[PDB]
Amino acid sequence: QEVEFDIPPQALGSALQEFGRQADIQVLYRPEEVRNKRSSAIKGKLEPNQAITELLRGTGASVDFQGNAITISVATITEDSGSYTPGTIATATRLVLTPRETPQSITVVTRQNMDDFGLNNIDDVMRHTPGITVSAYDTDRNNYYARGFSINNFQYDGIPSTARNVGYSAGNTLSDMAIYDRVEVLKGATGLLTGAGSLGATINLIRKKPTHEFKGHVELGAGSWDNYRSELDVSGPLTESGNVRGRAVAAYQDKHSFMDHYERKTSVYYGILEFDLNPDTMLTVGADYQDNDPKGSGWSGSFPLFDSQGNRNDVSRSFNNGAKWSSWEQYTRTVFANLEHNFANGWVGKVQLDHKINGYHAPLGAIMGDWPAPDNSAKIVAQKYTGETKSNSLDIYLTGPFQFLGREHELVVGTSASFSHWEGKSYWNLRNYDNTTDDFINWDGDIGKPDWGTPSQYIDDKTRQLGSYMTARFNVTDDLNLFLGGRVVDYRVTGLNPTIRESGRFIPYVGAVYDLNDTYSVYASYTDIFMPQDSWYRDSSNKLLEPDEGQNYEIGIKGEYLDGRLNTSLAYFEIHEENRAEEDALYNSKPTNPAITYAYKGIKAKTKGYEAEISGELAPGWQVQAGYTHKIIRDDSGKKVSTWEPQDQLSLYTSYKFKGALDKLTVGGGARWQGKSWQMVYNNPRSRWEKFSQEDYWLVDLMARYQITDKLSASVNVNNVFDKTYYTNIGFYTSASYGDPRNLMFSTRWDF
């Protein structure tokens, strides 16, 4: 039937509510998709379907007709945006939201930020992520601190990594950025989609996808300490019809460092294909690979803190405790297939399979122990660790809208499964060779390579992980939105050690967001995560500790300007942990139970702090990424933990694009500051606890770029401009590690 209409120009949402009255139809729409837009004038006797299209002219909004009601939708990739701020995030719940819509701490490092500052691996990225502190273990191993906790949760297009034991590092901590669009760090307790994991944060990595128009580049680089780099990216349609699309990228890097007899070379490959089956169904298959091959790898720091009889060691930044032949090899490869379908009711389901391999081949050799000796001699501890993890993952989810009280809401319902298997060899039963070296001062890593002998310990671990989850976002007011969600998990691990089993574990997700303006919004959330304890963490009665669990209490205010080209946020958080594995010196002074010698205690801990950050456009061609974070974490006795992670930290990185005849020049820079940190260490020769402190220090970088030809560009990066001599690790096995001296890296990019 034809109906008579009269609706003048007004704020879109009011005109939709009045359309329903003037057409006898129910109208379902998301207020946030509509607050920005505005309704065009309609007048006349028209058909409902024709009248609604005329009303929504110049907005690009979809209308889907079903029954006696109609639904309205007004709808990510960071590559080639020029922005340091994200568009949309589906990391938290799977629901595709804006930063301001999300009731959590979340920080995104964009393709542009990565290109601009020449961040080539995950380490460089973290060293530029506002609320994060990067400390070292040894040359080919680092630690990322967040809110008083180490980060053990690494995801790759949503699929969690099961190679979690950092004692056997196998790639997670040095992934090359050539194959990714962006890297998002979701802070707090992220159990909802991660499942079983740790507290602090979660690192999610999004892979590059094929374009529908041809696009490709070649970038060559050179830096300090014989540091070469090469990468090639090729993308676009592969059939005339364009029902298929592909993307292939290869990168190779070889380098040295300020440290002696040390080099690393990395090789990466990646290829992805897209298939259009019907107009609403798409298949994706892809494969990747990386290989980290070092020589002259260090172990447990760079040098010992004390000599033969205590005192204090003094050595140049170039000193490396590792032998020539020492190497910590780490290789990764993936094969995956995705499949998404769009259903008739605005609903969309996705199925992703994953097959991942994390391996290591680490013949190690370094000076460790209280050295040198009074005759300038020292000893080397030499061990060998080889292994491999094969991990198969299935995850499926459906997401779409639903009505309740004349309001449009959206739901997510999913299920996941994971089967992984970790096999490993360890050699320390050496067929007696000479440990000693003559010279400590003039150590150039020169010592023989031993016969490793037969394996000392075998590892053979099978892990099943099941998951089932649901999350809802209620549209109870225009200004107010309530999240109710949760996830149930089944964690089981079989192997040589006794079976670990947790059935029917539950993880809640509770969140609310209220709107004050068209600018500021307040939010609160309650989140949780747990991780089953490892075999050797046992109490006095030889019983296993209950899983390490924690909750994140967050409240704060977020901002948004220039319709999403700029975001501000200020939040206050509080993390309560239970079942933290600690010493128990009461038992360890005088053991009782013959079945265990070293026992543990499960205690509680509590981080309380706040955070302020900003990202995006500050002016037309002026981009920023900056944050301030304050934290203090305590035991249950009342003592500070993670004292090596600073209590106050400030990060700031900016770039300006010039105007006028010189719009071919770009100038940038960075400034990183952190407050004092310390570690309590034990002096063994002199039988005392000693305090080691690092003062507050600055870290400045500068950047300049020119768009030469039209296709050809060149850039320069200078890291640690002021050549600050500082430490990145102390208490780790009574060792120490310096931070990077002055840096340069030059680049040239072509763009086909």
Partner: peptide, 8 residues
Amino acid sequence: XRXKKKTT
């Protein structure tokens, strides 16, 4: 506490 035997 990763099950490795360094000096121990």
